[PDB]
PDB file of N, CA and C in Angstrom:
ATOM      1  N   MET A  63      29.594  11.476 -13.010  1.00  0.00           N
ATOM      2  CA  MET A  63      30.413  10.925 -12.135  1.00  0.00           C
ATOM      3  C   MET A  63      30.820   9.163 -13.006  1.00  0.00           C
ATOM      4  N   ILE A  64      31.535   8.437 -11.800  1.00  0.00           N
ATOM      5  CA  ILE A  64      31.585   7.091 -12.594  1.00  0.00           C
ATOM      6  C   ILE A  64      30.477   6.119 -12.058  1.00  0.00           C
ATOM      7  N   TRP A  65      29.569   5.618 -12.554  1.00  0.00           N
ATOM      8  CA  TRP A  65      28.447   5.132 -12.172  1.00  0.00           C
ATOM      9  C   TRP A  65      28.509   3.354 -11.482  1.00  0.00           C
ATOM     10  N   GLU A  66      27.696   2.976 -10.824  1.00  0.00           N
ATOM     11  CA  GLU A  66      28.049   1.581 -10.490  1.00  0.00           C
ATOM     12  C   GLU A  66      27.326   0.847 -11.501  1.00  0.00           C
ATOM     13  N   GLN A  67      27.600  -0.541 -11.455  1.00  0.00           N
ATOM     14  CA  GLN A  67      27.409  -1.531 -12.531  1.00  0.00           C
ATOM     15  C   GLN A  67      26.569  -2.695 -11.825  1.00  0.00           C
ATOM     16  N   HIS A  68      25.299  -3.141 -12.294  1.00  0.00           N
ATOM     17  CA  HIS A  68      24.803  -4.081 -11.570  1.00  0.00           C
ATOM     18  C   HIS A  68      23.873  -4.974 -12.384  1.00  0.00           C
ATOM     19  N   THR A  69      23.759  -6.625 -12.304  1.00  0.00           N
ATOM     20  CA  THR A  69      23.406  -7.419 -12.876  1.00  0.00           C
ATOM     21  C   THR A  69      22.542  -8.152 -12.191  1.00  0.00           C
ATOM     22  N   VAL A  70      21.054  -8.100 -12.630  1.00  0.00           N
ATOM     23  CA  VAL A  70      19.844  -8.908 -11.795  1.00  0.00           C
ATOM     24  C   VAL A  70      19.408  -9.649 -12.735  1.00  0.00           C
ATOM     25  N   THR A  71      19.200 -10.763 -12.573  1.00  0.00           N
ATOM     26  CA  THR A  71      17.968 -11.752 -13.255  1.00  0.00           C
ATOM     27  C   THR A  71      16.279 -11.559 -12.481  1.00  0.00           C
ATOM     28  N   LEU A  72      15.787 -11.220 -13.582  1.00  0.00           N
ATOM     29  CA  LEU A  72      14.207 -11.250 -12.974  1.00  0.00           C
ATOM     30  C   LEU A  72      13.203 -12.378 -13.080  1.00  0.00           C
ATOM     31  N   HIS A  73      12.546 -12.617 -12.518  1.00  0.00           N
ATOM     32  CA  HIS A  73      11.244 -13.484 -12.897  1.00  0.00           C
ATOM     33  C   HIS A  73       9.940 -13.534 -13.072  1.00  0.00           C
ATOM     34  N   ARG A  74       9.028 -13.145 -14.111  1.00  0.00           N
ATOM     35  CA  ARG A  74       8.167 -12.855 -14.280  1.00  0.00           C
ATOM     36  C   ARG A  74       6.767 -13.485 -13.092  1.00  0.00           C
ATOM     37  N   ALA A  75       6.089 -12.677 -12.778  1.00  0.00           N
ATOM     38  CA  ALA A  75       5.008 -12.896 -11.863  1.00  0.00           C
ATOM     39  C   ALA A  75       3.971 -12.292 -12.460  1.00  0.00           C
ATOM     40  N   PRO A  76       2.372 -13.437 -12.277  1.00  0.00           N
ATOM     41  CA  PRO A  76       1.398 -12.834 -12.695  1.00  0.00           C
ATOM     42  C   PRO A  76       0.851 -11.329 -12.093  1.00  0.00           C
ATOM     43  N   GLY A  77       0.370 -10.619 -13.252  1.00  0.00           N
ATOM     44  CA  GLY A  77       0.144  -9.410 -13.268  1.00  0.00           C
ATOM     45  C   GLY A  77       1.180  -8.416 -13.623  1.00  0.00           C
ATOM     46  N   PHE A  78       2.194  -8.489 -12.712  1.00  0.00           N
ATOM     47  CA  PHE A  78       3.384  -7.871 -12.674  1.00  0.00           C
ATOM     48  C   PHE A  78       4.207  -7.779 -14.173  1.00  0.00           C
ATOM     49  N   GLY A  79       4.265  -9.001 -14.691  1.00  0.00           N
ATOM     50  CA  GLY A  79       5.034  -9.287 -15.526  1.00  0.00           C
ATOM     51  C   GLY A  79       6.628  -9.079 -14.828  1.00  0.00           C
ATOM     52  N   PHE A  80       7.568  -8.301 -15.409  1.00  0.00           N
ATOM     53  CA  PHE A  80       8.870  -8.234 -14.766  1.00  0.00           C
ATOM     54  C   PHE A  80       8.571  -7.226 -13.799  1.00  0.00           C
ATOM     55  N   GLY A  81       7.460  -6.483 -13.586  1.00  0.00           N
ATOM     56  CA  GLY A  81       7.536  -5.021 -12.681  1.00  0.00           C
ATOM     57  C   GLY A  81       7.775  -4.328 -12.735  1.00  0.00           C
ATOM     58  N   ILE A  82       8.472  -3.531 -13.979  1.00  0.00           N
ATOM     59  CA  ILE A  82       9.212  -2.331 -14.292  1.00  0.00           C
ATOM     60  C   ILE A  82       8.442  -1.836 -15.659  1.00  0.00           C
ATOM     61  N   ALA A  83       8.714  -0.345 -15.657  1.00  0.00           N
ATOM     62  CA  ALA A  83       8.343   0.597 -16.642  1.00  0.00           C
ATOM     63  C   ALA A  83       9.648   0.894 -16.981  1.00  0.00           C
ATOM     64  N   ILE A  84       9.939   1.192 -18.359  1.00  0.00           N
ATOM     65  CA  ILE A  84      10.996   1.203 -19.157  1.00  0.00           C
ATOM     66  C   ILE A  84      10.812   2.508 -20.045  1.00  0.00           C
ATOM     67  N   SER A  85      11.401   4.021 -19.925  1.00  0.00           N
ATOM     68  CA  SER A  85      11.275   4.874 -20.701  1.00  0.00           C
ATOM     69  C   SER A  85      12.699   5.175 -21.426  1.00  0.00           C
ATOM     70  N   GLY A  86      12.899   6.333 -21.768  1.00  0.00           N
ATOM     71  CA  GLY A  86      13.909   6.545 -22.951  1.00  0.00           C
ATOM     72  C   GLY A  86      14.196   5.821 -24.107  1.00  0.00           C
ATOM     73  N   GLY A  87      15.005   5.974 -24.552  1.00  0.00           N
ATOM     74  CA  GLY A  87      15.513   5.562 -25.946  1.00  0.00           C
ATOM     75  C   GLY A  87      15.756   6.787 -26.813  1.00  0.00           C
ATOM     76  N   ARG A  88      16.779   6.155 -28.151  1.00  0.00           N
ATOM     77  CA  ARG A  88      16.748   7.677 -29.075  1.00  0.00           C
ATOM     78  C   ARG A  88      15.570   8.243 -29.492  1.00  0.00           C
ATOM     79  N   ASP A  89      14.774   7.798 -29.831  1.00  0.00           N
ATOM     80  CA  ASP A  89      13.446   8.487 -30.415  1.00  0.00           C
ATOM     81  C   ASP A  89      12.995   8.998 -28.872  1.00  0.00           C
ATOM     82  N   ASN A  90      13.224   8.903 -28.064  1.00  0.00           N
ATOM     83  CA  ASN A  90      12.479   9.520 -26.729  1.00  0.00           C
ATOM     84  C   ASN A  90      13.035   9.900 -25.664  1.00  0.00           C
ATOM     85  N   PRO A  91      13.601  11.265 -25.895  1.00  0.00           N
ATOM     86  CA  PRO A  91      14.402  11.894 -25.158  1.00  0.00           C
ATOM     87  C   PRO A  91      13.864  12.673 -23.538  1.00  0.00           C
ATOM     88  N   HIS A  92      14.712  12.820 -22.506  1.00  0.00           N
ATOM     89  CA  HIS A  92      13.809  13.298 -21.414  1.00  0.00           C
ATOM     90  C   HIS A  92      13.587  14.434 -21.905  1.00  0.00           C
ATOM     91  N   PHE A  93      12.175  15.155 -21.466  1.00  0.00           N
ATOM     92  CA  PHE A  93      11.872  16.158 -21.756  1.00  0.00           C
ATOM     93  C   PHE A  93      12.843  17.734 -21.337  1.00  0.00           C
ATOM     94  N   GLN A  94      13.457  17.326 -20.594  1.00  0.00           N
ATOM     95  CA  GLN A  94      14.749  18.266 -19.773  1.00  0.00           C
ATOM     96  C   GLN A  94      15.886  18.260 -20.088  1.00  0.00           C
ATOM     97  N   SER A  95      16.666  17.148 -20.015  1.00  0.00           N
ATOM     98  CA  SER A  95      18.014  16.776 -20.115  1.00  0.00           C
ATOM     99  C   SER A  95      18.331  16.324 -21.326  1.00  0.00           C
ATOM    100  N   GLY A  96      17.099  16.214 -22.182  1.00  0.00           N
ATOM    101  CA  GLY A  96      17.579  15.508 -23.443  1.00  0.00           C
ATOM    102  C   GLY A  96      18.480  13.813 -23.424  1.00  0.00           C
ATOM    103  N   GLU A  97      18.398  13.909 -22.032  1.00  0.00           N
ATOM    104  CA  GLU A  97      19.081  12.290 -22.276  1.00  0.00           C
ATOM    105  C   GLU A  97      18.150  11.120 -22.882  1.00  0.00           C
ATOM    106  N   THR A  98      18.686  10.162 -23.506  1.00  0.00           N
ATOM    107  CA  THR A  98      18.387   9.149 -24.484  1.00  0.00           C
ATOM    108  C   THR A  98      18.312   7.715 -24.109  1.00  0.00           C
ATOM    109  N   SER A  99      19.163   7.504 -22.869  1.00  0.00           N
ATOM    110  CA  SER A  99      19.352   6.306 -22.375  1.00  0.00           C
ATOM    111  C   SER A  99      18.262   5.615 -22.133  1.00  0.00           C
ATOM    112  N   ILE A 100      18.035   4.102 -22.150  1.00  0.00           N
ATOM    113  CA  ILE A 100      17.189   3.391 -21.581  1.00  0.00           C
ATOM    114  C   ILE A 100      17.071   3.242 -20.172  1.00  0.00           C
ATOM    115  N   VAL A 101      15.508   3.828 -19.440  1.00  0.00           N
ATOM    116  CA  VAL A 101      15.906   3.880 -18.255  1.00  0.00           C
ATOM    117  C   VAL A 101      14.656   3.466 -17.432  1.00  0.00           C
ATOM    118  N   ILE A 102      14.847   2.712 -16.432  1.00  0.00           N
ATOM    119  CA  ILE A 102      13.676   2.320 -15.370  1.00  0.00           C
ATOM    120  C   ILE A 102      13.075   3.621 -15.117  1.00  0.00           C
ATOM    121  N   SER A 103      11.830   3.711 -15.028  1.00  0.00           N
ATOM    122  CA  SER A 103      11.019   4.793 -14.689  1.00  0.00           C
ATOM    123  C   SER A 103      10.228   4.271 -13.475  1.00  0.00           C
ATOM    124  N   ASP A 104       9.795   3.182 -13.440  1.00  0.00           N
ATOM    125  CA  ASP A 104       8.469   2.680 -12.183  1.00  0.00           C
ATOM    126  C   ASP A 104       9.556   0.839 -12.071  1.00  0.00           C
ATOM    127  N   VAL A 105       9.725   1.161 -10.460  1.00  0.00           N
ATOM    128  CA  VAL A 105       9.820  -0.369 -10.196  1.00  0.00           C
ATOM    129  C   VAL A 105       8.327  -0.685  -9.154  1.00  0.00           C
ATOM    130  N   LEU A 106       7.366  -1.894  -9.945  1.00  0.00           N
ATOM    131  CA  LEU A 106       6.340  -1.844  -9.100  1.00  0.00           C
ATOM    132  C   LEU A 106       6.377  -2.300  -7.775  1.00  0.00           C
ATOM    133  N   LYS A 107       6.030  -1.746  -6.452  1.00  0.00           N
ATOM    134  CA  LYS A 107       5.755  -2.340  -5.473  1.00  0.00           C
ATOM    135  C   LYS A 107       5.355  -3.876  -5.266  1.00  0.00           C
ATOM    136  N   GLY A 108       5.748  -4.689  -4.730  1.00  0.00           N
ATOM    137  CA  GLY A 108       4.980  -6.047  -4.527  1.00  0.00           C
ATOM    138  C   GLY A 108       5.762  -6.957  -5.776  1.00  0.00           C
ATOM    139  N   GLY A 109       5.989  -6.392  -6.723  1.00  0.00           N
ATOM    140  CA  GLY A 109       6.901  -7.221  -8.013  1.00  0.00           C
ATOM    141  C   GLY A 109       8.180  -7.642  -8.176  1.00  0.00           C
ATOM    142  N   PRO A 110       8.394  -8.462  -9.051  1.00  0.00           N
ATOM    143  CA  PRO A 110      10.027  -9.033  -9.170  1.00  0.00           C
ATOM    144  C   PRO A 110      10.790  -8.408  -9.141  1.00  0.00           C
ATOM    145  N   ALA A 111      10.653  -7.143  -9.453  1.00  0.00           N
ATOM    146  CA  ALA A 111      12.039  -6.231  -9.463  1.00  0.00           C
ATOM    147  C   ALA A 111      12.022  -5.490  -8.205  1.00  0.00           C
ATOM    148  N   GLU A 112      11.205  -5.312  -7.113  1.00  0.00           N
ATOM    149  CA  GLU A 112      11.616  -4.636  -6.181  1.00  0.00           C
ATOM    150  C   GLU A 112      13.043  -5.271  -5.033  1.00  0.00           C
ATOM    151  N   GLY A 113      13.874  -4.637  -4.955  1.00  0.00           N
ATOM    152  CA  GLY A 113      15.049  -5.079  -4.077  1.00  0.00           C
ATOM    153  C   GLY A 113      15.570  -5.576  -5.023  1.00  0.00           C
ATOM    154  N   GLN A 114      15.806  -5.473  -6.512  1.00  0.00           N
ATOM    155  CA  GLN A 114      16.208  -5.891  -7.652  1.00  0.00           C
ATOM    156  C   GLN A 114      17.011  -4.672  -8.156  1.00  0.00           C
ATOM    157  N   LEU A 115      16.213  -3.729  -8.783  1.00  0.00           N
ATOM    158  CA  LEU A 115      16.191  -2.627  -9.257  1.00  0.00           C
ATOM    159  C   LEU A 115      15.738  -1.508  -9.135  1.00  0.00           C
ATOM    160  N   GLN A 116      16.446  -0.189  -9.250  1.00  0.00           N
ATOM    161  CA  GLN A 116      15.719   1.108  -8.989  1.00  0.00           C
ATOM    162  C   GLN A 116      15.316   2.025  -9.634  1.00  0.00           C
ATOM    163  N   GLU A 117      14.215   2.780  -9.695  1.00  0.00           N
ATOM    164  CA  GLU A 117      14.084   3.648 -10.340  1.00  0.00           C
ATOM    165  C   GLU A 117      15.139   4.734 -10.929  1.00  0.00           C
ATOM    166  N   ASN A 118      15.275   5.011 -11.990  1.00  0.00           N
ATOM    167  CA  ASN A 118      16.437   5.913 -12.778  1.00  0.00           C
ATOM    168  C   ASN A 118      17.657   5.469 -12.904  1.00  0.00           C
ATOM    169  N   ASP A 119      17.586   3.531 -12.578  1.00  0.00           N
ATOM    170  CA  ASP A 119      18.705   2.796 -13.412  1.00  0.00           C
ATOM    171  C   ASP A 119      18.586   3.101 -14.647  1.00  0.00           C
ATOM    172  N   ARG A 120      19.687   3.223 -15.382  1.00  0.00           N
ATOM    173  CA  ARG A 120      20.096   2.991 -17.072  1.00  0.00           C
ATOM    174  C   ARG A 120      20.307   1.732 -17.243  1.00  0.00           C
ATOM    175  N   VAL A 121      19.410   1.199 -18.201  1.00  0.00           N
ATOM    176  CA  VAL A 121      19.680  -0.173 -18.564  1.00  0.00           C
ATOM    177  C   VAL A 121      20.745  -0.290 -20.055  1.00  0.00           C
ATOM    178  N   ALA A 122      21.635  -1.270 -19.642  1.00  0.00           N
ATOM    179  CA  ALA A 122      22.665  -1.216 -20.705  1.00  0.00           C
ATOM    180  C   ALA A 122      22.617  -2.361 -21.404  1.00  0.00           C
ATOM    181  N   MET A 123      21.965  -3.630 -20.877  1.00  0.00           N
ATOM    182  CA  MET A 123      21.868  -4.845 -21.692  1.00  0.00           C
ATOM    183  C   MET A 123      20.992  -5.657 -21.034  1.00  0.00           C
ATOM    184  N   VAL A 124      20.125  -6.425 -21.881  1.00  0.00           N
ATOM    185  CA  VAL A 124      19.070  -7.197 -21.685  1.00  0.00           C
ATOM    186  C   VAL A 124      19.105  -8.964 -22.521  1.00  0.00           C
ATOM    187  N   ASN A 125      19.245 -10.052 -21.742  1.00  0.00           N
ATOM    188  CA  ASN A 125      19.998 -10.885 -22.316  1.00  0.00           C
ATOM    189  C   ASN A 125      20.844 -11.010 -23.196  1.00  0.00           C
ATOM    190  N   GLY A 126      21.587 -10.384 -22.838  1.00  0.00           N
ATOM    191  CA  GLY A 126      22.818 -10.241 -24.015  1.00  0.00           C
ATOM    192  C   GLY A 126      23.064  -9.415 -25.266  1.00  0.00           C
ATOM    193  N   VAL A 127      21.735  -8.399 -25.289  1.00  0.00           N
ATOM    194  CA  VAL A 127      21.219  -7.584 -26.324  1.00  0.00           C
ATOM    195  C   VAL A 127      21.618  -6.044 -25.846  1.00  0.00           C
ATOM    196  N   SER A 128      22.276  -5.339 -26.186  1.00  0.00           N
ATOM    197  CA  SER A 128      22.749  -3.948 -25.887  1.00  0.00           C
ATOM    198  C   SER A 128      21.418  -3.160 -26.118  1.00  0.00           C
ATOM    199  N   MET A 129      21.967  -2.228 -25.343  1.00  0.00           N
ATOM    200  CA  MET A 129      20.355  -1.084 -25.299  1.00  0.00           C
ATOM    201  C   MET A 129      21.062   0.115 -25.462  1.00  0.00           C
ATOM    202  N   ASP A 130      22.611   0.110 -25.609  1.00  0.00           N
ATOM    203  CA  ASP A 130      23.076   1.561 -26.375  1.00  0.00           C
ATOM    204  C   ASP A 130      22.309   2.178 -27.560  1.00  0.00           C
ATOM    205  N   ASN A 131      21.829   3.383 -27.257  1.00  0.00           N
ATOM    206  CA  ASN A 131      21.531   4.193 -28.692  1.00  0.00           C
ATOM    207  C   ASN A 131      19.902   3.608 -29.348  1.00  0.00           C
ATOM    208  N   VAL A 132      19.478   2.550 -28.481  1.00  0.00           N
ATOM    209  CA  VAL A 132      18.374   1.949 -29.117  1.00  0.00           C
ATOM    210  C   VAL A 132      16.815   2.538 -29.142  1.00  0.00           C
ATOM    211  N   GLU A 133      16.009   2.381 -29.791  1.00  0.00           N
ATOM    212  CA  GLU A 133      14.941   2.999 -29.791  1.00  0.00           C
ATOM    213  C   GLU A 133      13.782   2.229 -28.639  1.00  0.00           C
ATOM    214  N   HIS A 134      12.983   3.121 -28.101  1.00  0.00           N
ATOM    215  CA  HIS A 134      12.132   2.965 -27.224  1.00  0.00           C
ATOM    216  C   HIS A 134      11.728   1.542 -27.049  1.00  0.00           C
ATOM    217  N   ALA A 135      11.079   1.321 -28.492  1.00  0.00           N
ATOM    218  CA  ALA A 135      10.282  -0.101 -28.915  1.00  0.00           C
ATOM    219  C   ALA A 135      11.002  -1.129 -28.949  1.00  0.00           C
ATOM    220  N   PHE A 136      12.276  -0.982 -29.063  1.00  0.00           N
ATOM    221  CA  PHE A 136      13.116  -2.097 -29.178  1.00  0.00           C
ATOM    222  C   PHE A 136      13.422  -2.942 -27.900  1.00  0.00           C
ATOM    223  N   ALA A 137      13.987  -1.785 -27.390  1.00  0.00           N
ATOM    224  CA  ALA A 137      13.965  -1.975 -25.801  1.00  0.00           C
ATOM    225  C   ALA A 137      12.665  -2.840 -24.908  1.00  0.00           C
ATOM    226  N   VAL A 138      11.543  -2.325 -25.128  1.00  0.00           N
ATOM    227  CA  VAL A 138      10.198  -2.893 -24.837  1.00  0.00           C
ATOM    228  C   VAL A 138      10.099  -4.200 -25.098  1.00  0.00           C
ATOM    229  N   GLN A 139      10.466  -4.513 -26.585  1.00  0.00           N
ATOM    230  CA  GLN A 139      10.107  -5.923 -27.016  1.00  0.00           C
ATOM    231  C   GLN A 139      11.435  -6.769 -26.525  1.00  0.00           C
ATOM    232  N   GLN A 140      12.293  -6.271 -26.405  1.00  0.00           N
ATOM    233  CA  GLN A 140      13.447  -7.421 -26.030  1.00  0.00           C
ATOM    234  C   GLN A 140      12.963  -7.668 -24.568  1.00  0.00           C
ATOM    235  N   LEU A 141      12.238  -6.893 -23.729  1.00  0.00           N
ATOM    236  CA  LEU A 141      11.998  -7.460 -22.494  1.00  0.00           C
ATOM    237  C   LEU A 141      10.317  -8.297 -22.538  1.00  0.00           C
ATOM    238  N   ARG A 142       9.623  -7.768 -23.299  1.00  0.00           N
ATOM    239  CA  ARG A 142       8.382  -8.602 -23.040  1.00  0.00           C
ATOM    240  C   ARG A 142       8.611  -9.900 -24.117  1.00  0.00           C
ATOM    241  N   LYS A 143       9.550  -9.898 -24.941  1.00  0.00           N
ATOM    242  CA  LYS A 143       9.419 -11.339 -25.438  1.00  0.00           C
ATOM    243  C   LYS A 143      10.368 -12.174 -24.737  1.00  0.00           C
ATOM    244  N   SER A 144      10.905 -11.600 -23.366  1.00  0.00           N
ATOM    245  CA  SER A 144      11.767 -12.802 -22.861  1.00  0.00           C
ATOM    246  C   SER A 144      11.141 -13.995 -21.988  1.00  0.00           C
ATOM    247  N   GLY A 145      11.880 -14.599 -21.724  1.00  0.00           N
ATOM    248  CA  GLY A 145      11.493 -16.002 -21.158  1.00  0.00           C
ATOM    249  C   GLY A 145      10.838 -15.947 -19.508  1.00  0.00           C
ATOM    250  N   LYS A 146      11.008 -16.664 -18.734  1.00  0.00           N
ATOM    251  CA  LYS A 146      10.630 -16.446 -17.530  1.00  0.00           C
ATOM    252  C   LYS A 146      11.274 -15.872 -16.903  1.00  0.00           C
ATOM    253  N   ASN A 147      12.871 -15.854 -17.179  1.00  0.00           N
ATOM    254  CA  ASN A 147      13.788 -15.318 -16.737  1.00  0.00           C
ATOM    255  C   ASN A 147      14.210 -13.742 -17.733  1.00  0.00           C
ATOM    256  N   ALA A 148      14.885 -13.015 -17.157  1.00  0.00           N
ATOM    257  CA  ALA A 148      15.560 -11.959 -17.624  1.00  0.00           C
ATOM    258  C   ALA A 148      16.548 -11.264 -17.403  1.00  0.00           C
ATOM    259  N   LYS A 149      17.829 -11.227 -17.705  1.00  0.00           N
ATOM    260  CA  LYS A 149      18.897 -10.799 -17.202  1.00  0.00           C
ATOM    261  C   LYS A 149      19.554  -9.583 -17.767  1.00  0.00           C
ATOM    262  N   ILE A 150      19.600  -8.821 -16.868  1.00  0.00           N
ATOM    263  CA  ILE A 150      19.258  -7.342 -17.301  1.00  0.00           C
ATOM    264  C   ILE A 150      20.366  -6.696 -16.620  1.00  0.00           C
ATOM    265  N   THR A 151      21.511  -5.890 -16.831  1.00  0.00           N
ATOM    266  CA  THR A 151      22.415  -5.148 -16.433  1.00  0.00           C
ATOM    267  C   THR A 151      22.406  -3.603 -16.394  1.00  0.00           C
ATOM    268  N   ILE A 152      22.601  -2.750 -15.159  1.00  0.00           N
ATOM    269  CA  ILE A 152      22.160  -1.485 -15.543  1.00  0.00           C
ATOM    270  C   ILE A 152      23.247  -1.179 -14.806  1.00  0.00           C
ATOM    271  N   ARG A 153      23.377   0.509 -14.978  1.00  0.00           N
ATOM    272  CA  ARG A 153      24.318   1.239 -14.051  1.00  0.00           C
ATOM    273  C   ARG A 153      23.195   2.501 -13.256  1.00  0.00           C
ATOM    274  N   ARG A 154      23.627   2.504 -12.127  1.00  0.00           N
ATOM    275  CA  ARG A 154      23.071   3.121 -10.991  1.00  0.00           C
ATOM    276  C   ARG A 154      24.268   4.580 -10.546  1.00  0.00           C
ATOM    277  N   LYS A 155      23.665   5.616 -10.233  1.00  0.00           N
ATOM    278  CA  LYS A 155      24.539   6.729  -9.717  1.00  0.00           C
ATOM    279  C   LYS A 155      24.867   6.196  -8.435  1.00  0.00           C
ATOM    280  N   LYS A 156      26.415   6.297  -8.175  1.00  0.00           N
ATOM    281  CA  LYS A 156      27.013   5.771  -6.379  1.00  0.00           C
ATOM    282  C   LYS A 156      25.868   6.265  -5.472  1.00  0.00           C
ATOM    283  N   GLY A 157      25.848   5.329  -4.872  1.00  0.00           N
ATOM    284  CA  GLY A 157      25.061   5.624  -3.686  1.00  0.00           C
ATOM    285  C   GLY A 157      23.537   5.548  -4.090  1.00  0.00           C
ATOM    286  N   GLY A 158      23.033   4.852  -4.957  1.00  0.00           N
ATOM    287  CA  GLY A 158      21.823   4.565  -5.405  1.00  0.00           C
ATOM    288  C   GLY A 158      21.132   3.514  -4.863  1.00  0.00           C
ATOM    289  N   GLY A 159      22.137   2.408  -4.031  1.00  0.00           N
ATOM    290  CA  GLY A 159      21.225   1.806  -3.488  1.00  0.00           C
ATOM    291  C   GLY A 159      20.560   2.234  -2.102  1.00  0.00           C
ATOM    292  N   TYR A 160      20.814   3.577  -1.921  1.00  0.00           N
ATOM    293  CA  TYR A 160      20.171   4.465  -0.813  1.00  0.00           C
ATOM    294  C   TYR A 160      19.169   5.444  -1.415  1.00  0.00           C
ATOM    295  N   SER A 161      18.299   6.211  -0.269  1.00  0.00           N
ATOM    296  CA  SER A 161      17.442   6.972  -0.556  1.00  0.00           C
ATOM    297  C   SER A 161      18.535   8.405  -0.818  1.00  0.00           C
ATOM    298  N   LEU A 162      19.180   8.438   0.302  1.00  0.00           N
ATOM    299  CA  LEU A 162      20.125   9.683   0.447  1.00  0.00           C
ATOM    300  C   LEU A 162      21.460   9.263   0.350  1.00  0.00           C
ATOM    301  N   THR A 163      22.186  10.188  -0.281  1.00  0.00           N
ATOM    302  CA  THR A 163      23.616  10.212  -0.689  1.00  0.00           C
ATOM    303  C   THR A 163      24.008  11.828  -0.615  1.00  0.00           C
ATOM    304  N   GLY A 164      25.454  11.951   0.055  1.00  0.00           N
ATOM    305  CA  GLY A 164      25.614  13.291   0.294  1.00  0.00           C
ATOM    306  C   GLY A 164      26.945  13.611  -0.292  1.00  0.00           C
ATOM    307  N   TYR A 165      27.604  14.457  -0.812  1.00  0.00           N
ATOM    308  CA  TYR A 165      29.229  14.822  -0.819  1.00  0.00           C
ATOM    309  C   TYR A 165      29.529  15.497  -0.086  1.00  0.00           C
ATOM    310  N   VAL A 166      30.939  15.028   0.556  1.00  0.00           N
ATOM    311  CA  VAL A 166      31.597  15.990   1.632  1.00  0.00           C
ATOM    312  C   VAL A 166      33.009  16.210   0.871  1.00  0.00           C
TER     313      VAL A 166
END
């Protein structure tokens, strides 16, 4: 369908870092779907991304650098090398701000 687009700025916290896990990448397809987008696989509770990003968000850009068809390692390095702040633009399924969504 047509996905929602959102931009956030996350701030590092001790232990958590930015508080997200990253999967996908051109070299790292989902074992079923074959999807290669960089994706948010975990949003750590109590961390800086809770209430900012959702699991299964697709990462489009980090600090001005496109994540389109990039390698897994490249996306992880772009986030790990960020300063105090990281600007992240994602795509999210429509209704993805909620647990439940139903089409009628």
